[PDB]
Amino acid sequence: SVAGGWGPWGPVSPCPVTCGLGQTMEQRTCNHPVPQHGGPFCAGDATRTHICNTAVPCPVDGEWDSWGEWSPCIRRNMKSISCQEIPGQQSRGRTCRGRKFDGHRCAGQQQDIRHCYSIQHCPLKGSWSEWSTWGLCMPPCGPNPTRARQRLCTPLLPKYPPTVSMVEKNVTFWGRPLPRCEELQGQKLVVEEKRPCLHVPACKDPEE
Amino acid sequence: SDPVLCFTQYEESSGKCKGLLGGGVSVEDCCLNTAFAYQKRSGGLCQPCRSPRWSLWSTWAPCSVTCSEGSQLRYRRCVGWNGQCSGKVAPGTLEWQLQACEDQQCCPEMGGWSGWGPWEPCSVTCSKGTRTRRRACNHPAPKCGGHCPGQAQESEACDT
Ligand SMILES: *[C@@H]1O[C@H](CO)[C@@H](O[C@@H]2O[C@H](CO)[C@@H](O)[C@H](O)[C@H]2NC(C)=O)[C@H](O)[C@H]1NC(C)=O
Ligand SMILES: *[C@@H]1O[C@@H](C)[C@@H](O)[C@@H](O[C@@H]2O[C@H](CO)[C@@H](O)[C@H](O)[C@H]2O)[C@@H]1O
Ligand SMILES: *[C@@H]1O[C@@H](C)[C@@H](O)[C@@H](O[C@@H]2O[C@H](CO)[C@@H](O)[C@H](O)[C@H]2O)[C@@H]1O
Ligand SMILES: *[C@H]1O[C@H](CO)[C@@H](O)[C@H](O)[C@@H]1O
Ligand SMILES: *[C@H]1O[C@H](CO)[C@@H](O)[C@H](O)[C@@H]1O
Ligand SMILES: *[C@H]1O[C@H](CO)[C@@H](O)[C@H](O)[C@@H]1O
Ligand SMILES: *[C@H]1O[C@H](CO)[C@@H](O)[C@H](O)[C@@H]1O
Ligand SMILES: *[C@H]1O[C@H](CO)[C@@H](O)[C@H](O)[C@@H]1O
Ligand SMILES: *[C@H]1O[C@H](CO)[C@@H](O)[C@H](O)[C@@H]1O
Ligand SMILES: *[C@H]1O[C@H](CO)[C@@H](O)[C@H](O)[C@@H]1O
Ligand SMILES: *[C@H]1O[C@H](CO)[C@@H](O)[C@H](O)[C@@H]1O
Ligand SMILES: *[C@H]1O[C@H](CO)[C@@H](O)[C@H](O)[C@@H]1O
Ligand SMILES: *[C@H]1O[C@H](CO)[C@@H](O)[C@H](O)[C@@H]1O
Ligand SMILES: *[C@@H]1O[C@@H](C)[C@@H](O)[C@@H](O)[C@@H]1O
């Protein structure tokens, strides 16, 4: 007489997460209409798995950005220590990024500090390096990819102590010295070979 | 409202999507949890819902020529959803590296023929056989593997 029909999908439980999406079940009933006097029951499943959306954002913990560059090597009550066996100090910083909806602040040091020697602009004796390996082809996707290798007047660094104290901490050389070489192929600092990269392929997104 | 596949986690090591919740959700809804990850299409690039960081450099593509000096590409990807990677670069943007490459120092050079030799015999135990002739690249002998154009053998009949 009356063939059963399914009512609408409805939830069976509260969504089990307090933020973002979760996994629940929805159910429906054969009562739209109810079967009567020998009419068929509803075909298919009364139950299914469903994603439930709370539409509520979860907390997001902050995350350190990358360390910045080292500040210049300096000593507290000295105009300059460069080209001298006088330990200085330098620092670099990072920012806690992306902390949101009551997420945790980033733990540990916002500032990084170390002992240095300044050889900034310091003239040193040099010797010529052997050829570097060929660099990358630049620009890699642009018009005329060329690769390079160099010989550099590399500086001979002073035989200073690796460590220091306040009655042992590591001391690092910092700064671009001015190394002194015999002229090689008309150059005082850098000799370069360039050459074109051959049969260059067009670079096309590998996600079409 | 462009349905994505929503995953419960990102494998840092591999950059793979793991624990599919399922589809029919926006990235916006998927990423309400920044611990989650998505795919815009089934099987492709997994994006985490956290802040954008550089992916791993890919494998070097094979050399553009098989015999000579060529070059080969590889990439890394801006992967994440709320922000930028390094500079003002938003996600799904590729960085590229182009490297010189060589499969062999030499390329195969082509050969030239010499001149057909004297013929062989057929079969004498009984009748109707075949007779052939030969040659070689004794001329411009092929340089690097190479090949001569045409045939080195040649056949015929003999009724005996
Ligand atoms: C000073 O720098 C040195 C490296 O030049 C650090 O030495 C390393 O220390 C760690 C301990 O955490 C060891 O795993 C390594 O084997 C050490 N390197 C070696 C022996 O080459 C050291 O941590 C730094 N700090 C101090 C205070 O000395
Ligand atoms: C319920 O209330 C929310 C406002 C948050 O405080 C929830 O914490 C979050 O829990 C989900 C799973 O429910 C995790 O993915 C998150 O890592 C966590 O921050 C809280 O359970
Ligand atoms: C790839 O395999 C190599 C061993 C060679 O057989 C290549 O063939 C040569 O390709 C170069 C330029 O790429 C050309 O001189 C000729 O197309 C061919 O001899 C092969 O492509
Ligand atoms: C319920 O199930 C499907 C519709 O989703 C059909 O088999 C029929 O409408 C039944 O009532
Ligand atoms: C439940 O499922 C979909 C809607 O989610 C439809 O098939 C229909 O509304 C059904 O009742
Ligand atoms: C800063 O410290 C080092 C780089 O010197 C790394 O551990 C990391 O990049 C951090 O941002
Ligand atoms: C400071 O340390 C050196 C420079 O001497 C580099 O590793 C880098 O520039 C860092 O900021
Ligand atoms: C520069 O480097 C040294 C001398 O300073 C030599 O080894 C080299 O040949 C070039 O003259
Ligand atoms: C570079 O030139 C050749 C090697 O390619 C050598 O003479 C030497 O290694 C130099 O550095
Ligand atoms: C550049 O040329 C090749 C590598 O492509 C080698 O001879 C060497 O590594 C050099 O740096
Ligand atoms: C590519 O860049 C360097 C190696 O060239 C590494 O940081 C890492 O392998 C990355 O995938
Ligand atoms: C030998 O074969 C033919 C001529 O018979 C040509 O392809 C070419 O001369 C080759 O050396
Ligand atoms: C063999 O075939 C004929 C002669 O036998 C010529 O076309 C040519 O000399 C080839 O070597
Ligand atoms: C030589 O003799 C005859 C009788 C058969 O054996 C043949 O196959 C063969 O060529």
Numbering used by the authors:
A (entry chain A): 255 to 421, 426 to 466
B (entry chain B): 27 to 186
Quote what the paper states about this structure:
Properdin is the only known intrinsic positive regulator of the complement system. Properdin stabilizes C3bBb, increasing the half-life of the enzyme complex 5- to 10-fold. Properdin forms seven domains, an N-terminal domain of unknown fold, followed by six thrombospondin type I repeats (TSR) domains. Oligomeric full-length properdin consists of ring-shaped vertices, formed by N- and C-terminal domains of separate protomers.
IMAC-affinity purification yielded stable protein complexes consistent with one-to-one non-covalent complexes of PN1 with P456 and PN12 with P456, denoted PN1/456 and PN12/456, respectively. Under physiological salt conditions, PN12/456 bound C3b with a KD of 6.8 ± 0.2 μM, which is similar to the KD of 7.8 μM reported by Pedersen et al. for single properdin vertices generated by proteolytic cleavage, but much lower than the apparent KD of 22 ± 2 nM for oligomeric properdin. PN12/456 bound C3bB and C3bBb with a KD of 98 ± 2 nM and 34 ± 1 nM, respectively,, whereas properdin oligomers bound with an apparent KD of 4.6 ± 1 nM and 4.4 ± 1 nM, respectively. Preceding the prototypical C-terminal Cys (Cys133), TSR1 contains an additional cysteine (Cys132) that connects to Cys170 of TSR2, as observed in the structure of PN12/456. In PN12/456, we observe O-fucosylation of TSR1 (Thr92), TSR2 (Thr151), and TSR4 (Thr272), although the TSR2 glycan is poorly defined. Trp145 is located on TSR2, which exhibits overall poor density in the crystal structure of PN12/456. Similarly, TSR2 also shows structural flexibility; the orientation of TSR2 in one C3bBbPc complex matches the orientation observed in PN12/456, whereas in the other copy TSR2 is at a 58° angle compared to TSR2 from PN12/456. The structures of PN1/456 and PN12/456 showed that the properdin vertex consists of the STB domain, TSR1, part of TSR4, TSR5, and TSR6 domains. TSR2 and ~66% of TSR4 are protruding from the vertex and form the properdin edges along with TSR3, which is absent in PN1/456 and PN12/456. PN1/456 and PN12/456 crystallized as thin plates, and resulted in highly anisotropic data, with anisotropic resolution limits of 2.0–2.9 Å and 2.5–3.9 Å, respectively.
